[PDB]
Amino acid sequence: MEILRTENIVKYFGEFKALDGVSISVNKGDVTLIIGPNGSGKSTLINVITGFLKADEGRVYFENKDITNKEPAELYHYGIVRTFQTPQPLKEMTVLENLLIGEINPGESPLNSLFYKKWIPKEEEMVEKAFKILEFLKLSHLYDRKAGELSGGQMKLVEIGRALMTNPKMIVMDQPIAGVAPGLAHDIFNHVLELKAKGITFLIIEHRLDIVLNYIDHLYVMFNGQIIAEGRGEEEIKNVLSDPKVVEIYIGE
Ligand SMILES: [Cl-]
Ligand SMILES: [Cl-]
């Protein structure tokens, strides 16, 4: 049931301690969200897990396999992928190409994958997969469209599509719907549930709780680098959100 766990993960940035012995467990097929005020190490944590950051101490286990500090190219073979915010160079490219760059160095980010330049492979095999995904996402009609011309929610959906290009078992997303209009937002998360349905596990960071909350089935709250609250399920979550210590981290300067 548990697909991912971290055992006392530590990360340092100089002398500052961004993370502080963070341990978390995530069950297969779950949609796990982590929240906390800016500066709590949510991102750093996510980056460590996805392999874009090195864990100074502690470990990460995927399906009970020690994967600590493996490069994203390697984690790709394990079924882990992170969604990447789209850079400007990619915005000049079509929606199809944006899914296609996920093929060059599977698991690696768009720019560490675009080291290959205009060599965005347009090989029949990959493209068919890109379309199959654009299809599932109900975006094939925008396959030829320059990504920079899409709405924020549209762009977010494309990024999810770029990740699916790696047939992941788990998708890690840092703020999938920030700046996305409510209707498109629920739609994005709708597709997540659609994916949860096929057995895909999610680890998400978000700040707009007024939308997201109805979709997550595992919450974690973080402050100063450590897990300061957990709550599995609707009821526990309502409690977690009620708890005054949580509200307080958001008030007082
Ligand atoms: Cl590092
Ligand atoms: Cl927002």
Q: Which domains does the chain have, with CATH numbers?
A: 1-253 (3.40.50.300)
Please give the C-alpha separations between residue 179 and each of 38, 175, 185, in angstroms, as whole numbers.
16, 9, 9
Tell me whether residue 170 is exposed, middle or buried, using C-beta atoms within 10 angstroms of its C-beta: 0 to 12, 13 to 18, 19 or more: buried
Could you tell me the two tokens for 36?
A: 């906390």
Q: Which of the ligands is closest to the CA of residue 181? A: 2
Task: Please report where in the chains the tokens 């950051």 appear, as a residue.
Answer: 53
Rounded Cα distance between 76 and 163, Å, is 10
Distance 246 CA to ligand 1 centre (A): 30
Q: How far is the CA of 179 from the centre of ligand 1 (A)?
A: 29
Span from the CA of 236 to the centroid of ligand 2 (angstroms): 25
* Spacing, Cα 108 to ligand 1 middle (Å): 15
| C-alpha count within 13 angstroms, C-beta hemisphere, residue 68 | 14
- Nearest CA-CA partner of 18 in 243, 231, 223, 235: 223
Q: Please, is 49 exposed, middle or buried when counting C-beta atoms within 10 Å of its C-beta (0-12, 13-18, 19+)?
A: buried
Dihedral angle over CA of 247, 188, 49, 165, nearest 10: 180
φ, ψ of residue 11 in degrees (nearest 5): -145, 135
State which approach was used to obtain the coordinates: X-ray
CB 177 within 8 A of CB 151: no
Crossing angle of helices 152-164 and 182-197, rounded to 10°: 20
Q: At what angle do helices 124-136 and 152-164 cross, to 10 degrees?
A: 130
* 237: CB partners within 8 A, 6+ apart: 213, 216, 219, 231
Sequence-ordered list of residues with C-beta below 8 angstroms from that of 156, at least 6 positions apart, any chain: 176, 177, 180, 188
CB atoms within 10 A of CB 180: 23
d(CA 201, CA 199): 7
Distance CA 161, CA 133 (A): 6
Six-digit token string for 38:
């800016």
Ligand closest to 12 (CA) is 1
Residue 68, amino acid: T
Contact 156, 188 (CB under 8 A): yes
Measured CA to CA, the distance from residue 181 to residue 145 in angstroms comes to 21
The number of residues in the chain equals: 253
CA of 153 to the centre of ligand 1 (A): 30
With a CB cutoff of 8 Å and minimum separation 6, the contacts of 122 are 100
Ligand 1 centroid to residue 52 C-alpha, Å: 7
Give backbone dihedrals phi and psi of 68, rounded to 5 degrees, phi first: -40, 130
How far from 206 is each of 97, 101, 141, CA to CA, in Å? 27, 26, 29
96-100 long-range contacts (CB < 8 A, ≥24 apart) are 96/127, 96/130, 96/131, 96/134, 96/143, 96/144, 97/147, 98/147, 98/158, 98/159, 98/161, 98/162, 99/130, 99/133, 99/134, 99/158, 99/161, 99/162, 99/164, 99/165, 100/126, 100/127, 100/130, 100/165
- The residue among 108, 158, 110 whose CA lies nearest residue 133 is 158
Output the CA 182–ligand 2 centroid distance in Å. 10
**At which residue do the structure tokens 């890690």 appear?**
172
CA within 13 Å, CB half, 33: 25
Residues measured by CB to lie within 5 Å of ligand 1, the ion: 53-54
| Closest ligand relative to 54 C-alpha | 1
Centre of ligand 1 to C-alpha 182, Å, is: 35
